[PDB]
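Researcher: Here's my situation. A collaborator sent me these components and asked whether they could plausibly form a single complex. I don't have experimental data yet, so a predicted model of the whole assembly would be a useful starting point for our discussion.
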Amino acid sequence: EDPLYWGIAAEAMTGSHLDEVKKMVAEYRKPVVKLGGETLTISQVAAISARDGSGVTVELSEAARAGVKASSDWVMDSMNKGTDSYGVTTGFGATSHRRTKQGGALQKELIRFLNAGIFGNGSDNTLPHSATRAAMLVRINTLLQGYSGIRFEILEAITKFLNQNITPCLPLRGTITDLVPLSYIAGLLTGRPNSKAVGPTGVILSPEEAFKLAGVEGGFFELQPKEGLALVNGTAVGSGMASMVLFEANILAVLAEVMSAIFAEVMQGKPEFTDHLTHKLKHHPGQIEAAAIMEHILDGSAYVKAAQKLHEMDPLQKPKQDRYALRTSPQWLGPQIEVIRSSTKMIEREINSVNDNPLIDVSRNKAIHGGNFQGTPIGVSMDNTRLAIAAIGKLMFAQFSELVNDFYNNGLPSNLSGGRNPSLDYGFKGAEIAMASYCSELQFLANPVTNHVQSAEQHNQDVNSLGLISSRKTSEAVEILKLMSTTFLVGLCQAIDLRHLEENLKSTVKNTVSSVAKRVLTMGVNGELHPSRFCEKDLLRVVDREYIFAYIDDPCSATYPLMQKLRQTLVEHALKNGDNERNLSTSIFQKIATFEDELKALLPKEVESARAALESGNPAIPNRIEECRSYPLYKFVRKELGTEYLTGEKVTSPGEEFEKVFIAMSKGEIIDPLLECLESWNGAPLPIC
Amino acid sequence: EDPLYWGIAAEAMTGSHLDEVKKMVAEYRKPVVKLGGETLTISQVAAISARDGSGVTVELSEAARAGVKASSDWVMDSMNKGTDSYGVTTGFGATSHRRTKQGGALQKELIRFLNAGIFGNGSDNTLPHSATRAAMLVRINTLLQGYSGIRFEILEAITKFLNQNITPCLPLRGTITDLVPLSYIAGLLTGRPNSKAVGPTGVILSPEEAFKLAGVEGGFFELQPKEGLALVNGTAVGSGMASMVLFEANILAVLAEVMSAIFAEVMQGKPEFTDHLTHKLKHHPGQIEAAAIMEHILDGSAYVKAAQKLHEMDPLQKPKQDRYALRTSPQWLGPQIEVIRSSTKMIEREINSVNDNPLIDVSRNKAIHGGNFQGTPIGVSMDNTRLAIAAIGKLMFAQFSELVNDFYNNGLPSNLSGGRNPSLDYGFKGAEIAMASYCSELQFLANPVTNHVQSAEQHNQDVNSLGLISSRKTSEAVEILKLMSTTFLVGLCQAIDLRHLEENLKSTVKNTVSSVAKRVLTMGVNGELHPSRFCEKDLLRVVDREYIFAYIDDPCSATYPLMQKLRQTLVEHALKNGDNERNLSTSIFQKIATFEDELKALLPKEVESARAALESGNPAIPNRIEECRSYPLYKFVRKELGTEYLTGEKVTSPGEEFEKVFIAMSKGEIIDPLLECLESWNGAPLPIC
């Protein structure tokens, strides 16, 4: 038995978060949103909220018509009092004019006085068109259950406004959660003189023009008793925006998980941080999933092809462990995903609720007075979600910070500088400062809204949810997270390209050091300069150990580590060379100057040629990202969007390439390549038995 | 003309902040606080709030008696109505029992219903005894001006409670600013059955016992009309605590300025960050003062005895500039000092105000109704001050963080590790984590209180100041700042000692390298090994350049920089030695192994002997702090308090030495050595013409 509905709520949180997101995306893309009052999802709200020409249409279920008609008829019959039925349903004052021999005067008055919002000039004080559409959809859905006492024909009209993209202008502020803004939908429906709508290209329309462009099958509505209240009493503005916000938040949470893995790839982090034992032993499902997702990426990574201590390619980090933004990312992200998921279910309940008062219960033949207009689930879910968005942002800032710091990024250039001359390429330094600015503002936004409740409306509304205000702040937080995600993703793709450059230039240095050592370290009296064999292999070990980016811009400079360490190796072999060292013809020390002169003459041009080869699409060694599970995201950013590698040798600024990713992100184009990174995952961690 | 008193307020902010603090300290130490209603300072409140046996006493000015009597007489005469004077003064309901043929029933009722606070068991819900004493003092002072209609004898009684350290128990919470808590002072005065006081050693007293121990010249008071309101209507609880808080805040602001300079000394920062031109050109007085204070310290610093690039002692930072917590400290601290100063003046006005209602104006023969109980100046000053305390804390965290990071601290050991074996001495690492915890909590506390106003008391108090609640949060913030200041100051003294160790061990290494090079790099066939002269001087240059703490724990280790760089120098000289290199007897290369063997045999014991000499109080080179203007603070912490140098060679933990400084700080013992650091300063910056 599940008498209080905790059971059904619990069941909605089984299965992975990723499978939930996949389902959300598939639902978003459906061509038709069919409303019946009970199956509206945040994905449908997000799809409809769009004004981007996807062609999505809304259809009302005919199965809901009978119940809607029953309560609208009931209210009309209820007005006939005394010698018929009883007193009067209930507006907010039994005495006045309501369609008897009167004429619906109270409903006209309701919408007039609720039109108390301020738009001013321009758009700064107007609710976004997307958000108004979300509100309209939710508003229809929460009147379809048949308990609201409104005509189906009004629902059909709002549906036409949605389908023809004719959008009433609503004020941004005025609600403590949504009478004031919702009264501007009602005022369009009733052709109030101040009502305005906007067409698909932004043209301002009169209510007359709006009805004609939308195809409304009728003239202005004259509201019946209960209809004005039915239209204005909902939580639809707050919950519609919350739905939009949570669609984005769910996707960005998956992006954060996958970026944490790509971060680990380019950082050469020890992949054992994702070992399932660790996460199993904490029990938290968000953390277990996050780790299993990162593990999936790392298990199919060509970078995790790692050479251990005294490294040649990628090392673990045994001495000087990986820092927390890498190694604790599953622990950090997990609870944020859990909050986003729980919040999503709260909002999905809200947008299928009857948020009206009083409810018209035809079965019991009475109106039921209550408090379902109290949007607490919106306020609470949006405050909690905003805190989680801030936490996701903080981790991204910390990861980004590690990535661009040459002391923490395991050999990558300071600032992810791309060009031949580091003194003319400061890479991501400006972006890094911008990332701090994004993170700081996100942490300010993390503060709650719902702890600022005023005792309102002659102290009748002595608690009130502040749901829309909170939704608006969470929306602002999500936009900043998209700025951060954009900046970080472009940074990660830069680092991928730098690792490709690194492996190629290291190969060329080894090749050249080899050639020179062979020529110079045998000469003798008669060839074989004893010794030379162990000396060559140790010189190459220097190359394998040293960070390319610590010297490759001036490889034969006396004060850079290549020349220094190569000389140190020659000196070490000379000191071990015994009596052969004391004969000039077999002396290693006496070949240092020659070795250095011959390396200086050859190495710069060899490095330059290899680099040019790589820049022309013909590197000696292919870019290992092509064999990684994360390739779809790199391919998308680099090839599909044309985001280019950033270098001080060219004029292009980081912002110019960030625009490409941000604009794509805001159009939903990152969804497919993101999910493609995980499409082979079976939804389970790797075994640990 | 100054009709609105902006002029007098402006004049109170002339002269330096430091001179203000000096004056504050001198006032604090006076043996007698004489109250007249108009000259109470935060220093007097702080002195009285103490329960530490300083012997400070309160005395009431006889000059105030006449005005106090006039208004108390006026109220009593005003009760005689109709055939005498007029209706009735004004309590809060003209109808009832007030000392005619009645008996002061309304005043008894007032105190009863206001006793609505909760103490529970233990001390967690009780106002601190210090803060209650502050409240008592302010409460007396704000009734002495003669407009309150209360008997002088009641003021004399509260004075006795202060002088004999008999303190009524007040609830911690219950006020939106201070009826509820102040009613517990009134309830002691009237011997309410639930009233309690605490004696000097914490013994709980009945009102009877309290009167007897305090010497009250009378039995319990029977309050006259207006007396109950006069006692309970003030802002004294909030403003008394604010006064305490601001006394500490002013001192800690000076400590932060001086510590910023000592930080710069031990970091080897470029002192030009304090150049007066820079700060003059921004005009902000707090910043100009802060810079001039730091400049004063640095101008008398034996550390600012600096050797420039290719350094031997202390360098500037031309390449890789000093980081912001060093170089922007005046810009950062200035506005915080300005806010602390402005807040101080707000509170000093408040504690000399008449915060009562109605005011009894004997000259005009009427009661004047108004709103002076509205403690907005407390709420606002305490919110603004708390934000400034958080900013001071953030800078201290950032400075501390630089100080303990070997990548940022210009040669000091990672963690300020003190012992011979770094693998068994992690220094201040735990303290550094604690510093983050302090800073984070301070940033939470920085949020305002005064934006959480409820519409209170049947919506009569539809705005209210929340002054005490804010004072309490600012007090908590100040305590955390004292934890941070303690931890940082002990860290700075450790760094001072490490710089002393560094200079001494470097001297010993130079001496030894010199001796060995002289012995080994001349041998030849007949003495003079050509060459040897330039080789020796370059080997010493290696020692001068290299950071002692990068190798001194194992100075002849092959993989540490001393052995490596010394070998590099020998090799460089051999390569330049021409044909002499090719003769075995004049070869520099052939002496490397010998040089290294002889250095390995001598250097460890020489370093150990020098160190032991230093530890015994007989270093080769004296600790340069003895010749610095900052010496008084180091001397205080190290000698006077016995705070010892921290080392993993001993059992003592950092916390144990932090206790010494924290306890001293909380007793005001840091004030004198702090101010001594600046006592030669003439209050002006160094000239820049």
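Model: Some features of this prediction you could bring to your collaborator: DSSP finds 24 helices and seven strands in chain B. The longest strand of chain B covers residues 32-35.
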